[PDB]
Amino acid sequence: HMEPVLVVHGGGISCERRQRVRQGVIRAASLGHGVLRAGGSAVDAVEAAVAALEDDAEFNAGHGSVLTENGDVEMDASIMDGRDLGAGAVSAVRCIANPIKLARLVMDKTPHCFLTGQGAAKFAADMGISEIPGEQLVTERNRKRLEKERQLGTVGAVALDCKGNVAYATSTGGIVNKMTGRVGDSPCIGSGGYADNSIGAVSTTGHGESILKVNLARLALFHLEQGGKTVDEAADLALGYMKSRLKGLGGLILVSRTGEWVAKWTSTSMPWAAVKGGKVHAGIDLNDTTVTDLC
């Protein structure tokens, strides 16, 4: 039996904002950790944590997603089971409250790993999931950001369950003013995340095009798997390469198969929280990390 670990991240700050964002990552991580403490799977727990961050309007996924060039919300998500490399993903999903829950259904109920657009909507209907009015996903802060851009990152979770299984989930609204039908890294296995019981699990955030081009999640783990490196060093190398090769900035969370974990970023900030044992860890910048008793 392994001691379970759940890590979450938000994206990339009106001080009353800092505090709600911090509260949101702590809530989603404690929620996912609760699943693991009850004997649920790593997959069950990442789904739960990421669906909570989707429902939280302060984060760029589900409700609160950034807007496309058309003032529309288009969402991407992916989930992976490190035991059998099971995977599900959805891209350019519209009018769906919880894209990560649809991605998990692609994984579990179809022989495919990735559905897009109208195909993903049809499958959602076949699963009994209802469409919601598009404007319910849109916030006034995001309308404003859209106008500004015409003259935020992802959400994610990694887990290690009591049986030694790892999983990631990632979900996002994308990048503000994106072209209709743009697909970023978050639904793409290898880039937005990767999970393998032989190594570990990763979920990423940042400049999606750079993340895709270096396959950042899978890269962090190649570094971990070849030896002589801790989770910290493996993550700094992977993010180090993205920055040096492409100038692309971002962040990642990583949990090894032995339960060591890290949150690292080369952007200015990355909301994150982790729960292991009886302690909750969280922060946003280099200097504001806190640790408190779980309850």
Add this chain to the structure above:
Amino acid sequence: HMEPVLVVHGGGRRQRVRQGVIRAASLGHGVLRAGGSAVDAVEAAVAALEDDAEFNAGHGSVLTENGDVEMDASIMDGRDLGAGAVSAVRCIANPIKLARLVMDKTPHCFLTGQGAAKFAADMGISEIPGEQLVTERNRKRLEKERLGTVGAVALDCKGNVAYATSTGGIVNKMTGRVGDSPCIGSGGYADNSIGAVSTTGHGESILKVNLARLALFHLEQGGKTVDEAADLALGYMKSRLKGLGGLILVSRTGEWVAKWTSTSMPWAAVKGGKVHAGIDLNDTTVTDLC
């Protein structure tokens, strides 16, 4: 200035198929001999395979559950890691040519569905009637259910590498299913520091192991040949997931290979005046370029 290489593959009547891969690799190699880029050359080769009704890509793509064609394609420039991809494209003759415009004309790497059609429109590319991409063999195969991808890799005269991959997907597939072909690291990968790969076979498996980047991971922790890297990458997919397929690979120094674990994989390569081609472990031919 390096000796240039172009490799192509098909998926998984045998003479027409063999002629196709050879025609495609010679076309792409001519681009390189004229001093065109690795990207130029992979685009040209895959577009030839798209146009050839014998290969599952572009004209000749397999049909979805609704008897429709939906195509995926990707391209990557190993010099700066530039990349473009499209998924679930309908009514477009040349998906790889759209993928290349995504790479060169947008600040994005991947477009899907109706957004990709809108971008095609912005670029001046016409939609064609959908039935034009449909052959009778494919209407037939769709009945029976009630072929893989195509690819190229290239090394050019200045030492740059690139891949392209394009596919119609899998017969009777779910609407909006996306496979490995448009996904960077899985349908292919290219990086001047190592090499380029393009893949074919069971797409979900190729996605789960990121087959293309995996082949290169084996190649880059040196003292391994391109053959060994391919067998390792492919051997892991077979053993871990029982997934079969194949790949083509060329290193930054010009060594190249075509490997597969499926029953066959049409392939061709052109290097130093010679054209190599095959379908099975047996029937390999080498002839001079004319």
